[PDB]
């Protein structure tokens, strides 16, 4: 359910306190938009692993820098 | 007279406690060998009512017989804390007393009184079995001087 | 040493040994605690002549290791093979 | 030469097989072990009646430290610091200066008895028999601080124990 | 400048190992707080984990990074198997240590240490 | 009534001694004292975790053999019967079958503990 | 035949002469793949042939152990297995090649 | 005939020299130096790449048979660019002989684990890693073995202070043992003992 997949992914972002829900969009870049660094990205990816329930090997995770890229990856 | 009664009752409980001292089966290094010699036939600590028991729940005295390292320090504190009260500690030998010949070591606690309170300090490296037996008898006389019920009475 | 005859027989019989001849408690067979003074001997270097230290100086005879090969025919072993041990004639089997 | 501790072939004749059958069923080797502890029950025990009786020691015994004097009462110690240098545990601390007269004497002489290993190197190193380990081994204390001996405590030990100490040195000095 | 590697041929392989260790520590903090019965919260444990990774963020030598990851993994195995005790886990928090000043004047008053 | 009085007295005295033991001594309770014992280091996992039984087969056999003694206990009374031919046969029949089952479990390695 | 070798875990060999001929022969074949001038090949062929000559000359197992001077015959067989394993590993290691690298200037200078 | 002087054994010296070059002839790819001491001990100095080939050869070769690893340890020499020297002491029961094999490494270069050759090496290599920080590759289980859990540093390094950086005590406020920066009521007294006169001319180094 691609629509819901976006719904759940953005649900996680809103909780990650360092991410201000005011400035977030499905196309924001974690580095140059929210101001997070690498280990924040690792924490964000680990949240999506919990919420969806499947492994994201480090090779795949280090490309997911936008919420949409996570949405697209989730589909696959 | 309450004063007379509590005075006598201290004698009773003090006599019972010093006459039935059960040390924890606890030894660390060299000095534990002299402790074994104090249990041996020549001195026979058991003839004083001093009986080794392994469980801290059933022990009254911790004889710290040997070097206390930093790695062993939490374990020694754990088994001391698990002793029911009243409980006493005898520090045996230079290592336990103040670090001894590993005093300047990076891995050695410089005296077991940094970790537990100590009632009697027995000097030597190692103290002879008789020197330890003298230390145990000195602890007995210390217990004989306790004034728990007299102090309770006057509170 | 003070045990009565009957107890001596009882404990000798029980252990199967003659215990009285090899008592584990010490009595008068041990040395006196006051002894005559010693007069200890002297070593071989106690001489008034022919005793120059340079001729008996062990430390100064130690040499740096001999370099066999530096990175600057019959096969051998480190030593001959060890001779096989022999059974004790004293008591080969315990 | 070597020997075998456990390399036996047991006999298979009827007598030997029955002797082992009786042993298994009648516990003969277990009864033999009871006899040996029974024989100890009737032996005189090795316990001594401490503190009324004491374990034997020799003149060489290494016990509590003491600082000695000459017969005139002058201190033997000359603050040479050889004992401090050799001490394996670094348990000795010394300071010295010229006394009010011209004498070379210590102003500090400490032994941390909780650092000391009672090895006796200090009395071996001393050239004037000033520092000795005495025969006393019954000086356990209730506090740690009581085992940090300063010069006053050690001089008192020598004055307290000299009568025994001098006799012990007299018995052993020809072995030194 | 040719040397024998430990695990990583270059810094990009090394950072992959660093990220993996961070995940293992991140997942472990909730269990460590539970097993050892710590009075800190999971956020505090994870903040401390993050702090320890950031003190080394300036390394550029893959062999040095490989060793820090190696040591970090032994550190983690000690915690998971409860070879550590509560005292060892709490040594990371320096609770009994008083705060040493960092400004000049405070150092000047207390003593001579720079 | 004698028996119930004896049982009541025995367990009452035991309960009284426990009550004295808990109310007479001076208590000093804190977390580290009452923590579980395991030789100085904190236990690894709970003590309620499963503990493998390697003699599980012997324990089940104990059930079947324990009922045999219930069947054999009446034998002293059974020896008073006039019909001694029948009882002796049946008494021996039961014991032999008990012996047979032991032999069967022994030979099949039921008495050896699992690894 | 002996009842035991006396060493725990070392079983008695029924046919020690046959086993020793097979193992030494295998060693020699493996050595044939090492370069001719490699010292390991030259020395190991030399000692392996010497033992093989003793195995053929002496049929008595007690007397053979006396010649080989290497313990029980079962210890000799085990050693031949060890050598055969070593020869196979030496082919892949190739330690007859020149020194891989000189040490730093004073790596082995003691005292400093 | 000199009561105080240790006698020489030139037979053993000769035998060890011959074997030392025998090993150098068979393992030229690795052996960097062979020496025999005046008290008759043979040392083989090898390139670290040759730890497994050299130890395997000494164990398995029919003229070696060093079946026992007596000791495995490290020495720290800070003045060397490869500060750590790894020392293997082996014993051959068959030939009643001992041999020492030595190699080198630094703080960042791994040494191959010799557990495949000697299972005795498992704990010896953990001790070297623990006390010196030398990493052994392909070790089945490399972790501290002697130092306290979570201990930081490698105490046997020459630049590690004798008393370390932290000490322990029990703190009543937190009800646990705590670690704190080390303070000594009496500082260890450094002694300068070396005499300024040369003792052994035989070991003098060129100026
Ligand atoms: C219930 C049971 C208790 C009630 C019966 C009490 C029996 C009388 C006890 C007297 C013992 C003291 C004897 C004595 O005079 O002291 C010697 C002692 C001086 O003698 P000593 O020169 O130092 O040494 C004596 C012998 O040379 C060194 O000792 P010894 O080893 O040579 O033995 C000497 C003597 C010591 O024994 C006795 O005198 C009493 C024997 C009672 C046996 C009861 C079992 O025994 C004998 O002479 C041999 C015959 C004794 C029977 C032996 C039977 C062995 C058991 C069978 C073997 C298989 C066992 C399984 O004086 C004391 O110290 C007196 C102290 C008081 C001791 C306690 C006595 C009262 C016991 C409790 C009474 C009831 C409450
Ligand atoms: C409940 C009834 C139990 C009462 C037992 C009283 C113990 C008697 C006793 O103290 O033994 C003599 C003890 C012996 O004294 P002691 O214990 O100091 O003797 C030291 C050991 N010796 C003698 C070997 C050197 O007397 C006392 O210590 C005085 C305490 C009296 C107890 C209080 C009674 C009220
Ligand atoms: C087989 C059966 C045997 C059973 C034997 C039963 C025991 C027989 C001997 C009884 C002797 C008298 C018992 C008194 C023991 C009281 C325990 C105690 O010492 O507590 C001290 C305490 C000390 O009281 P406190 O108020 O001074 O100090 C304790 C409080 N803190 C910890 C904060 C310091 O005194 C009492 O509890 C009251 C004593 C009253 C005596 C009755
Ligand atoms: C005419 C027709 C008549 C018909 C009847 C005739 C039959 C008579 C002969 C029958 C045999 C009599 C003995 C039977 C008793 C049981 C014997 C027994 O089972 O002992 C053997 C047992 C096994 O041990 P083990 O040798 O290791 O194993 C054997 C092979 N698996 O080993 C053991 O049990 C050892 C036990 C170890 C613990 C012993 C500790 C105490 C020892 C001292 C006890 C002394 C006994 C005192 C008894 C007090 C009496 C109230
Ligand atoms: S005090 Fe002496 S005898 Fe006792 S443990 Fe320490 S070194 Fe060993
Ligand atoms: S006995 Fe040994 S450790 Fe003690 S003060 Fe003398 S030299 Fe130092
Ligand atoms: S006690 Fe003896 S060795 Fe020590 S300083 Fe005095 S004279 Fe010198």
UniProtKB/TrEMBL annotation, chain F:
One GO cellular component term: mitochondrial inner membrane
Q: Which domain of life is it from?
A: Eukaryota
What is the recorded membrane topology of this protein? Multi-pass membrane protein
Its chief place of residence is mitochondrion
Q: What Pfam family does this protein match (any one)?
A: Oxidored_q4
Q: Which UniProt keywords apply?
A: Electron transport, Membrane, Mitochondrion, Mitochondrion inner membrane, NAD, Oxidoreductase, Respiratory chain, Translocase, Transmembrane, Transmembrane helix, Transport, Ubiquinone
Q: Which InterPro entries match?
A: NADH_UbQ/plastoQ_OxRdtase_su3, NDAH_ubi_oxred_su3_sf
Which top-level enzyme class is recorded in the Swiss-Prot or TrEMBL entry?
translocase
- EC number(s) recorded for this UniProt protein: 7.1.1.2
Q: Where are the transmembrane segments?
A: 55-75, 87-104
The keyword Electron transport belongs to this UniProt entry's keyword annotation: yes
Question: Could you tell me the Gene Ontology terms of the biological process aspect for this record?
Answer: mitochondrial electron transport, NADH to ubiquinone
Region forming the signal peptide: none
**An MF annotation (GO) of this entry:** NADH dehydrogenase (ubiquinone) activity
Record's subcellular location:
Mitochondrion inner membrane; Mitochondrion membrane
Its UniProt entry gives the catalysed reaction(s) as: a ubiquinone + NADH + 5 H(+)(in) = a ubiquinol + NAD(+) + 4 H(+)(out)
Q: Which family does it belong to?
A: Belongs to the complex I subunit 3 family.
**SUBUNIT field:** Core subunit of respiratory chain NADH dehydrogenase (Complex I) which is composed of 45 different subunits. Interacts with TMEM186. Interacts with TMEM242.
Q: Could you tell me what this protein does?
A: Core subunit of the mitochondrial membrane respiratory chain NADH dehydrogenase (Complex I) which catalyzes electron transfer from NADH through the respiratory chain, using ubiquinone as an electron acceptor. Essential for the catalytic activity of complex I.
Entry protein name: NADH-ubiquinone oxidoreductase chain 3
Q: Which organism is it from?
A: Bos taurus (Bovine)
According to the entry, what is the taxonomic lineage of the organism? Eukaryota, Metazoa, Chordata, Craniata, Vertebrata
């Amino acid at each position: 359910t691609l629509e819901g997949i976006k719904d759940r992914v953005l649900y996680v972002l809103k909780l990650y306190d360092k991410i201000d829900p005011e400035k977030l969009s499905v196309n924001s870049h974690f580095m140059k938009d929210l101001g997070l660094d690498s280990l924040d990205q690792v924490e964000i990816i680990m949240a999506m692993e919990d919420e969806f329930g499947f492994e994201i090997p480090d090779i795949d995770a280090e490309k997911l820098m936008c919420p949409q890229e996570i949405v697209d990856y989730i589909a696959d | 007279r309450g004063e007379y009664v509590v005075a006598k009752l201290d004698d009773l409980i003090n006599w019972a406690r010093r006459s039935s001292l059960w040390p924890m089966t606890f030894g660390l290094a060299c000095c534990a060998v002299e402790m074994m010699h104090m249990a041996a036939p020549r001195y026979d600590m058991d003839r004083f009512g001093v009986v080794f028991r392994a469980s801290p729940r059933q022990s009254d005295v911790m004889i710290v017989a040997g070097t206390l390292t930093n790695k062993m320090a939490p374990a020694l504190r754990k088994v001391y804390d698990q002793m029911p009260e009243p409980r006493y500690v005898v520090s045996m030998g230079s290592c336990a007393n103040g670090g001894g010949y590993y005093h300047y070591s990076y891995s050695v606690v410089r005296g077991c009184d940094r970790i537990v309170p100590v009632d009697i300090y027995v000097p030597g490296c190692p103290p002879t079995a008789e020197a330890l037996l003298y230390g145990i008898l000195q602890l007995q006389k210390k217990i004989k001087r306790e004034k728990r019920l007299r102090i309770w009475y006057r509170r | 040493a003070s045990a009565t005859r009957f107890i001596q027989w009882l404990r000798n019989w029980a252990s199967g040994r003659d215990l009285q001849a090899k008592l584990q408690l010490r009595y008068q067979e041990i040395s006196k605690r006051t002894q005559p003074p010693p007069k200890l001997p002297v070593g071989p270097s106690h001489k008034l002549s022919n005793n120059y230290y340079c001729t008996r100086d062990g430390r100064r005879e130690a040499m740096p290791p001999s370099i066999v090969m530096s990175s600057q025919k019959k096969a051998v072993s480190p030593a001959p093979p060890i001779k096989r041990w022999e059974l004790s004639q004293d008591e080969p089997y315990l | 030469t070597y020997k075998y501790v456990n390399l036996r072939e047991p006999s298979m004749d009827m007598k030997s097989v029955t002797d082992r059958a009786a042993q298994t069923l009648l516990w003969t080797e277990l009864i033999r072990g009871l006899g040996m502890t029974l024989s100890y029950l009737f032996r005189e025990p090795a316990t001594i009646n401490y503190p009324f009786e004491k374990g034997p020691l020799s003149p060489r015994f290494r016990g509590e430290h003491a600082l000695r004097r000459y017969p005139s009462g002058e201190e033997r110690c000359i603050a040479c610091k050889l004992c401090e240098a050799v001490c394996p545990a670094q348990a000795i601390t010394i300071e010295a200066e010229p006394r009010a007269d011209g004498s070379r004497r210590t102003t500090r002489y400490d032994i941390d008895m909780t650092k000391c290993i009672y090895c006796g190197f200090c009395q071996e190193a001393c050239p004037v028999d000033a520092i000795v380990e005495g025969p006393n081994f019954e000086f356990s204390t209730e506090t740690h601080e009581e085992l940090l001996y300063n010069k006053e405590k050690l001089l008192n030990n020598g004055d307290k124990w000299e009568a025994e100490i001098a006799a012990n040195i007299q018995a052993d000095y020809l072995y030194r | 400048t040719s040397v024998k590697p430990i695990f990583s041929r270059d810094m990009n392989e090394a950072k992959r190992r660093v990220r993996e260790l961070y995940r293992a520590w991140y997942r472990e903090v909730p269990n460590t707080v539970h097993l050892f019965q710590l009075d800190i919260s999971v956020k505090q444990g994870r903040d401390k984990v993050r702090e320890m990774f950031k003190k080394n963020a300036h390394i550029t030598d893959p062999r040095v990074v490989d060793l820090l990851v190696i040591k970090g993994k032994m550190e983690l195995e000690e915690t998971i198997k409860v070879w550590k005790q509560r005292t060892h886990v709490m040594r990371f928090f320096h609770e009994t240590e008083a705060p040493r000043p960092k400004d000049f004047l405070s150092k000047f008053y207390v003593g001579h240490d720079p | 009534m004698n028996l119930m009085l004896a049982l009541l007295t025995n367990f009452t005295l035991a309960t009284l001694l426990v009550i004295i033991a808990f109310w007479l001594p001076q208590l000093n309770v804190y977390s580290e004292k009452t923590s579980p014992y395991e030789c100085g280091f904190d236990p690894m996992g709970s003590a309620r975790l499963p503990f493998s039984m390697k003699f599980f087969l012997v324990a089940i056999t104990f059930l079947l053999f324990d009922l045999e003694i219930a069947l054999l206990l009446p034998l002293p009374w059974a020896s008073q019967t006039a019909n001694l031919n029948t009882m002796l046969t049946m008494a021996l029949f039961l014991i032999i079958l008990l012996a047979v089952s032991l032999a069967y479990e022994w030979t099949q390695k039921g008495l050896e503990w699992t690894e | 035949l002996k009842k035991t070798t006396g060493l725990v875990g070392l079983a008695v060999c029924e046919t020690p002469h046959e086993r020793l001929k097979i193992l030494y022969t295998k060693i020699l074949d493996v050595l044939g793949h090492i370069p001719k001038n490699a010292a390991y090949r030259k020395y190991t062929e030399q000692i392996t042939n010497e033992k093989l000559s003793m195995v053929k000359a002496e049929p008595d197992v007690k007397k053979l152990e006396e010649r080989l001077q290497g313990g029980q015959i079962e210890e000799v067989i085990l050693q031949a297995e060890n050598e055969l394993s070593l020869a196979r590993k030496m082919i892949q290691w190739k330690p007859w090649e020149p020194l891989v690298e000189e040490p730093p200037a004073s790596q082995w200078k003691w005292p400093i | 005939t000199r009561p105080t002087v240790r006698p020489r054994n030139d037979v053993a010296h000769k035998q060890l020299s011959a074997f030392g070059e025998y090993v150098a002839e068979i393992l030229p790819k690795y052996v960097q130096q062979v020496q025999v001491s005046c008290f008759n001990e043979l040392e083989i100095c090898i390139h670290p790449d040759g730890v497994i080939p050299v130890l395997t050869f000494l164990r398995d070769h029919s003229n070696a048979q060093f079946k026992s690893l007596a000791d495995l340890t490290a020495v720290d020499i800070p003045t060397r660019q490869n500060r750590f020297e790894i020392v293997y002491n082996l014993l051959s029961l068959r030939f009643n002989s001992r041999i020492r094999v030595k190699t080198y490494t630094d703080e960042l270069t791994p040494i191959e684990s010799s557990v495949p050759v000697y299972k005795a090496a498992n704990w010896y290599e953990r001790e070297i890693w623990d006390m010196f920080g030398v990493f052994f590759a392909n070790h089945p289980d490399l972790r501290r073995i002697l130092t306290d859990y979570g201990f930081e540093g490698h105490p046997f390094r020459k630049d590690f202070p004798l008393s370390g950086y932290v000490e322990l005590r029990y703190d009543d406020e937190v009800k646990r043992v705590v670690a704190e920066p080390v303070e000594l009521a009496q500082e260890f007294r450094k002694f300068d003992l070396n005499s300024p006169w040369e003792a052994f001319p035989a070991y003098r180094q060129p100026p």
